[PDB]
Amino acid sequence: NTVSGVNGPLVILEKVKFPRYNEIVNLTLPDGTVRQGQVLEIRGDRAIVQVFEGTSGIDVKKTTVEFTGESLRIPVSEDMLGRIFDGSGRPIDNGPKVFAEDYLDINGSPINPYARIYPEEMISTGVSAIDTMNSIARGQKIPIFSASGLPHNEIAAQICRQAGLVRPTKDVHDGHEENFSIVFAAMGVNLETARFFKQDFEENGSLERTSLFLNLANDPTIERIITPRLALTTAEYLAYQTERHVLTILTDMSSYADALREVSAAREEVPGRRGYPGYMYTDLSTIYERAGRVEGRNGSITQIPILTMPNDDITHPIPDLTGYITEGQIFVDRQLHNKGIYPPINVLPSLSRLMKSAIGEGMTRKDHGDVSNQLYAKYAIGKDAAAMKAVVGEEALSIEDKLSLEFLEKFEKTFITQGAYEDRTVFESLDQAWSLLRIYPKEMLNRISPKILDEFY
Amino acid sequence: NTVSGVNGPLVILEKVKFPRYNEIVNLTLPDGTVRQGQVLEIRGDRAIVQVFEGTSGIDVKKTTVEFTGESLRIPVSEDMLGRIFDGSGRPIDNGPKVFAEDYLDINGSPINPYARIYPEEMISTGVSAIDTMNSIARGQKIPIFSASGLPHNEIAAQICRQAGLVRPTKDVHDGHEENFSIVFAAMGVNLETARFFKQDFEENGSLERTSLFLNLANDPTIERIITPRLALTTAEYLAYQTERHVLTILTDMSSYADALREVSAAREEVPGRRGYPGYMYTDLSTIYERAGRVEGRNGSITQIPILTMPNDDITHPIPDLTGYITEGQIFVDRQLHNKGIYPPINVLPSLSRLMKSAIGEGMTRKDHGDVSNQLYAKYAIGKDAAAMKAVVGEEALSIEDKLSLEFLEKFEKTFITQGAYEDRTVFESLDQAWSLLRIYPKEMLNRISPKILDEFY
Amino acid sequence: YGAIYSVSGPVVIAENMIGCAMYELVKVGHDNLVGEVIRIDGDKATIQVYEETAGLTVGDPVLRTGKPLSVELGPGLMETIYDGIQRPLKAIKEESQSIYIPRGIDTPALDRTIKWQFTPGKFQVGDHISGGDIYGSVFENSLISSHKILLPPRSRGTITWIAPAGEYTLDEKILEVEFDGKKSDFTLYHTWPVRVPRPVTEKLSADYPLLTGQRVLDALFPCVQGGTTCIPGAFGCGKTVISQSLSKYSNSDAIIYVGCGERGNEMAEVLMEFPELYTEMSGTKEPIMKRTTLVANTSNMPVAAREASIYTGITLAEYFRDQGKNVSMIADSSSRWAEALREISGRLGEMPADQGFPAYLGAKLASFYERAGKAVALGSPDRTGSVSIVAAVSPAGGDFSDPVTTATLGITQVFWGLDKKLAQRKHFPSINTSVSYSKYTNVLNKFYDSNYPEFPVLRDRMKEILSNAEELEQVVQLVGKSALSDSDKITLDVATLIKEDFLQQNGYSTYDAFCPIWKTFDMMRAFISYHDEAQKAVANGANWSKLADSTGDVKHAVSSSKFFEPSRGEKEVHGEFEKLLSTMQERFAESTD
Amino acid sequence: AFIILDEVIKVTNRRVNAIEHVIIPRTENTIAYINSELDELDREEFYRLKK
Known part of the structure; x- marks a missing residue:
């Protein structure tokens, strides 16, 4: 029937209860506007709907409703590549619409046929500090966790432009034999910044192969929370149908959290851990189930989600759940950024679970994972030795600390400093590691086996 | 209609909806006992009132209600100075009525009879420490923040009583040529403590200059919030209409925070952190709205609120929010109190955001702003230097710090230590200041112009 | 429109809203206080009334203003x-x-x-006008006009009535636009x-x-x-x-x-x-x-x-x-x-x-x-x-x-x-x-470099000097002066002159508050030129105190550039800086020898 | 005396740096985590009761 009342952007309708879940409703308002909504709730002769357009400007008994008869499902094509969109799937260039060739659910995974063969073949992004220290696979999810005030978006730009200039040399080594496409989701990202991501895609050659979804925080909350799910349906369709690796850059994870937080206050839900939703798990998990190899095992969706730390803490719920559901993390540290290191990838907690399950041979060394273990363990020791230098002073320090002090300094300006339009090969990073790691005797190098060690220190 | 129920402080009356809001009702009891209240909420055939005296002792079919037909207002006159009122504006004279010439509503005024004009004339408290370092100005509010390690009311009394002895000193200087008045509000004071304040005004001759509105610790929480609103309206009348500068002393704001927190802003509703409402700000802001320079341009109400910090805390909501609205604060400490320093006032954590700029020149010399730079600096250096003396001795102590060690002592023992009924004019206060700085040569007072310093040293 | 159902503190509840947008501006009761409808449950609206309701009664009407806030x-x-x-x-x-x-x-x-002078734009009788197109302009101060009147967004059409130039009041209409009938007055x-x-x-x-x-x-x-x-x-x-x-x-x-x-x-x-x-x-x-x-x-x-x-x-x-x-x-x-x-x-x-x-x-x-x-x-x-x-x-x-x-x-x-x-x-x-x-710096230094300034090179060097200066002082405390020498001593000194010239201001002069893009470029050019040449000079044999005393006049004249006029070499161009480069070369000869 | 001074300066320097690096930032990290938990208790308590 009519709008009974309206609370924030959820609308209480009085309407007959026969419609199915997620079906579109259209409210015809006396302003001339039609606004679309989704039944969030069906109840006995009443519904609670989230409006897509707006959050207000909604009349009581003068507003009327009409049913589509159709569940909320995204019209997905592969003709949506090479064109720039908003967060609800419509061109902002105002030319021909998304259109469809399928409709796919965002309320539950469609097929859900993820990985029964572990993602295990390497993906290179042209960065030593990423690729060595954290091994990336085709379907694996490793996120970039940074702090407020950092250029999270600039590091994400590096990843995009250098990935796909590696790929033909990597094609030879075996790591691709299929089309590569980017699906880019912005929630809460600046106009300027977005324009930088388009430029990145021009450089790479995948402005024609990418879809960009722009939601601003000055566009409804309800649109904002659809934007990642819309991204996922697009990305698994390319991946499925024509067996493509799609890399998803989903910025920013807390912006998405933010919107969930407002339709929790507006719901009859109580917020759990630190003012965020007590169903915060279900949200995050919907995104992470979709990632891994999809049917035919030459298509995949690979994820790098981007998180900015809202309070700059790794005890705050957002990073803590997110980190558990994903496979590892990549840390960015503020002290580095200020110094003018690029990329400022501090490898003190940066670890990726698949390290000996993301590598094989014929494109990686099996030693690749082993080398990582020296590099990470020494980095830490070195970092500790520098902490003691600051306090006690060199004279006081013992011989073991001095070596390690030295290792740390060399690590910062050579390993994690590289250019921003400069590609690297996995072989090449390991050869750079061996020289730098070569500053200790065989007694002290013991996080790799004597066979491999005897050859190379 | 009769009383439906009472649940805690809140009273439910079934009485019809025809009363207006702020409307006084009379509880007619069968015990010969009439009690008055103000409607907190008026609803459809029910009203929720909190009763000005008591909350229990009423029946549900032998207590009946009547509506007066007149809302909560104070009979305002200038014959109210020298007269003792309670927390409804009823006398505790035991003689003649209040007297009116107008009836003014108490809510932060119906019309808001204030303008915003920057402060320009000194207001003096009769104590050097407040006036030189963190001066009080016409329409500027600087609270005294003290703690429950102090005799906070007793200090509060010294400020208040010494006021209006200032007015003949200002008169020779030509800064105030129009009368002084004191409006005193006691919230949550003890019978004995209340008595001390009163006796101190009689002795000084300041009884004639003040009107006291009394709220006792045993009177209802709603009675207590009514109490300052009576005082400020009375001040607003004196100030606007007969052009007096009126200094209003509100002790204790901490009790005021307690009454709101308990009920009347946490009736059943959700308050912010630590049980203290988030709209506790909004309430504080009502008091500040009825304070300031008023039409006439020889009329203002200058305000000194007294807030007592529970345990000396800087993370509790009470000093922090209050502290944003007020233009600085005077911080009192426990440390001075032990040593035998009275009144124990430190001027280092303290701030007055606008010192010279707030106050004028004509009844205060030009040197006030300059001198404050030197006294503050030395005082800071002085705390540090004493800690250093304890360790290093005086065989390797620095010369600059050696004079500052002696400086810390005098600053406390003569500029901060004063009598009970010792009153000092602003000119005088300035002279003492220079005497303490006189020990240092010119080369350790280098943050001041040689013209001013050569005159004042 | 509505009838007040209830008043609970500063929130007012009014029933019998049979159409009212959830942003709609409202005047409640007969006090006519400001409020805006926060939420609606049924015909009962929650309205926050932002002024006090002391004197407001249940059973008074609430009249909608007929447009949002x-x-x-x-x-x-x-x-x-x-x-x-x-x-x-x-x-x-x-x-x-x-x-x-x-x-x-x-x-x-x-x-x-106020009445203001309206002069027509460029769309005349029967001309099609479209969104954000300038229909006229009005003076917004005596000196200058700044409020150009554009066609409102979400409108478009043909202009059936264009009022002639003259002074008109804010109340009075001037334009009617036709699209779908008379769309409304402007x-x-x-x-x-x-x-x-x-x-x-x-x-x-x-x-x-x-x-x-x-x-x-x-x-x-x-x-x-x-x-x-x-x-x-x-x-x-x-x-x-x-x-x-x-x-x-x-x-x-x-x-x-x-x-x-x-x-x-x-x-x-x-x-x-x-x-x-x-x-x-x-x-x-x-x-x-x-x-x-x-x-x-x-x-x-x-x-x-x-x-x-x-x-x-x-x-x-x-x-x-x-x-x-x-x-x-x-x-x-x-x-x-x-x-x-x-x-x-x-x-x-x-x-x-x-x-x-x-x-x-x-x-x-x-x-x-x-x-x-x-x-x-x-x-x-x-x-x-x-x-x-x-x-x-x-x-x-x-x-x-x-x-x-x-x-x-x-x-x-x-x-x-x-x-x-x-x-x-x-x-x-x-x-x-x-x-x-x-982080705007990147695009910005690029913008300024185009204009004529050598800006990107000089700015980076500014940051470096401040960072270094801080760092050499810590060494003087812990390590001592044994790690200090005159090359470092010049570094401390350049940073001091940069702080005084750039960082300190308070509007002592009129030329201390507007300094063009070209003037700012010129101050940093003196100080970096002093730095590199002082260091060269102490390496061919000189001392810090000796450099300090010798640089002297130039050093004083360039600190004082903020008090000095920025119209000395034209109107934005300062002549003293242009004459500094040559002085500095002759000066470097005095400092070395 | 000079030799005893020589010894004492090394010890004393260790200490200023030791309070600075290890103690103060440990104290910042702890105080924040428990403040945020503590506040969470007061607010969630109200929210559950109100609901």
Whole structure:
């Protein structure tokens, strides 16, 4: 029937209860506007709907409703590549619409046929500090966790432009034999910044192969929370149908959290851990189930989600759940950024679970994972030795600390400093590691086996 | 209609909806006992009132209600100075009525009879420490923040009583040529403590200059919030209409925070952190709205609120929010109190955001702003230097710090230590200041112009 | 329309709403106090009434104003002090004899004393007009016109009635446009809802600076106009001072001053100082005040006006962006602003979220900074404007790690600190090189380099010198002077001269407050030239004290360049710097030998 | 005396740096985590009761 009342952007309708879940409703308002909504709730002769357009400007008994008869499902094509969109799937260039060739659910995974063969073949992004220290696979999810005030978006730009200039040399080594496409989701990202991501895609050659979804925080909350799910349906369709690796850059994870937080206050839900939703798990998990190899095992969706730390803490719920559901993390540290290191990838907690399950041979060394273990363990020791230098002073320090002090300094300006339009090969990073790691005797190098060690220190 | 129920402080009356809001009702009891209240909420055939005296002792079919037909207002006159009122504006004279010439509503005024004009004339408290370092100005509010390690009311009394002895000193200087008045509000004071304040005004001759509105610790929480609103309206009348500068002393704001927190802003509703409402700000802001320079341009109400910090805390909501609205604060400490320093006032954590700029020149010399730079600096250096003396001795102590060690002592023992009924004019206060700085040569007072310093040293 | 069902504190409940938008502006009862319908459950609406309901009875009617809560922005905005619901406060002072409004009484948003001179644009009888196309213009001050009247967005058609040139009143219509019948009548002002931002053809990446001319501001961490900027405060320990400085040195087309919820001594101060001050472009007619339009709310004044304050400023500002005017937007303070929201949330009986501050908070802060920026205006002419938002924040709950501040640093691209010690010394803004950053720098240094300056090389070197200077002092404490030598001693000395010349200012001179892009370029050129040549000279054999004494006249003359006229070599070009290069070469000979 | 001074300066320097690096930032990290938990208790308590 009519709008009974309206609370924030959820609308209480009085309407007959026969419609199915997620079906579109259209409210015809006396302003001339039609606004679309989704039944969030069906109840006995009443519904609670989230409006897509707006959050207000909604009349009581003068507003009327009409049913589509159709569940909320995204019209997905592969003709949506090479064109720039908003967060609800419509061109902002105002030319021909998304259109469809399928409709796919965002309320539950469609097929859900993820990985029964572990993602295990390497993906290179042209960065030593990423690729060595954290091994990336085709379907694996490793996120970039940074702090407020950092250029999270600039590091994400590096990843995009250098990935796909590696790929033909990597094609030879075996790591691709299929089309590569980017699906880019912005929630809460600046106009300027977005324009930088388009430029990145021009450089790479995948402005024609990418879809960009722009939601601003000055566009409804309800649109904002659809934007990642819309991204996922697009990305698994390319991946499925024509067996493509799609890399998803989903910025920013807390912006998405933010919107969930407002339709929790507006719901009859109580917020759990630190003012965020007590169903915060279900949200995050919907995104992470979709990632891994999809049917035919030459298509995949690979994820790098981007998180900015809202309070700059790794005890705050957002990073803590997110980190558990994903496979590892990549840390960015503020002290580095200020110094003018690029990329400022501090490898003190940066670890990726698949390290000996993301590598094989014929494109990686099996030693690749082993080398990582020296590099990470020494980095830490070195970092500790520098902490003691600051306090006690060199004279006081013992011989073991001095070596390690030295290792740390060399690590910062050579390993994690590289250019921003400069590609690297996995072989090449390991050869750079061996020289730098070569500053200790065989007694002290013991996080790799004597066979491999005897050859190379 | 009769009383439906009472649940805690809140009273439910079934009485019809025809009363207006702020409307006084009379509880007619069968015990010969009439009690008055103000409607907190008026609803459809029910009203929720909190009763000005008591909350229990009423029946549900032998207590009946009547509506007066007149809302909560104070009979305002200038014959109210020298007269003792309670927390409804009823006398505790035991003689003649209040007297009116107008009836003014108490809510932060119906019309808001204030303008915003920057402060320009000194207001003096009769104590050097407040006036030189963190001066009080016409329409500027600087609270005294003290703690429950102090005799906070007793200090509060010294400020208040010494006021209006200032007015003949200002008169020779030509800064105030129009009368002084004191409006005193006691919230949550003890019978004995209340008595001390009163006796101190009689002795000084300041009884004639003040009107006291009394709220006792045993009177209802709603009675207590009514109490300052009576005082400020009375001040607003004196100030606007007969052009007096009126200094209003509100002790204790901490009790005021307690009454709101308990009920009347946490009736059943959700308050912010630590049980203290988030709209506790909004309430504080009502008091500040009825304070300031008023039409006439020889009329203002200058305000000194007294807030007592529970345990000396800087993370509790009470000093922090209050502290944003007020233009600085005077911080009192426990440390001075032990040593035998009275009144124990430190001027280092303290701030007055606008010192010279707030106050004028004509009844205060030009040197006030300059001198404050030197006294503050030395005082800071002085705390540090004493800690250093304890360790290093005086065989390797620095010369600059050696004079500052002696400086810390005098600053406390003569500029901060004063009598009970010792009153000092602003000119005088300035002279003492220079005497303490006189020990240092010119080369350790280098943050001041040689013209001013050569005159004042 | 409706009947009051209930009154519970400052929230008013009214039944028998049979159509009422959930943003709709309403006058409740017979007091006629301001309120806006927060939520609706059934025919019962929850309305927050933002003024006191002492005298309001259940059983009184509530009449809808017939439009949402919107503000009219017209000519005459300039030289006026306003609320966030927009009432002229000077008017109140006239009538009631008070700058605060009387409750239950309101006054027209724009002054109606004022009459302004309208001259036709370029669309004439029967010409098609389209959105953002300039239908005319009106003087907005005596000296200058600035309010160009464009066709309202969401309209388009043929203009059936175009009034002729002349002075008309804000009340009286001038234009009727036909599309679908007479679409409606138009006035010299247009209304636009406060939470709806005005539109553009597209937004651009700003590369254009502020016209502040504050030397350290320009060179070290370059000012952007079309940017977002967070500045620490703690109130009157420098932060209000810099906002007043920013107003003064600036000479933007418009400046919109927002007091979100300030102390009210500070609002009084802004009003009085500005017409006595002088514009640094050399304009007249109450100078700074003429270019400033003031929304000045103290925290005492209703909560509606506080919340509406930023909104009203951004919509106004955005319209000026559509007019082709570069706007400086000064907000003081967002910490207060977050508090306006938390208050409303607890009253209503909704749950606020993290740190007792609401759920809606983050989306609202975020929308506000992203709304501001450089754009080309809507319509065929495509004039360029900018909106730069500089918002002040202080600690809220006394922790400066709480959600409000931390949320905003993440969004910001620009940060310029405040420190109590630096503020005492007269360095304003109170910045060094790690309490401040700008990520706008990259595009900006590129922009300036094009103009003629050797800017990118010189700026990087500025940062390096300050960083080094700090570092060599620590060594002098722990290690000693054994790690100190004269090469290092010159490094300390160049940083001191850079601090005094750039960082310290307070407007001692008129030439100390406007310094062009070309002048700023010239100061950094002297000091870097001194540095490299002093170091060379001590290596071929010289001492620090010897270098210091010898450089002397030049050293004194270049420090004093801020007091000196910037019209010495033309009008922006300073002659002394051009003559420094040659002196420095002859000088280097004196220092070495 | 000079030799005893020589010894004492090394010890004393260790200590200023030791309070600075290890103690103060440990104290910042702890105080924040427990403040945020503590506040969470007071607010969630109200929210559950209100609901």
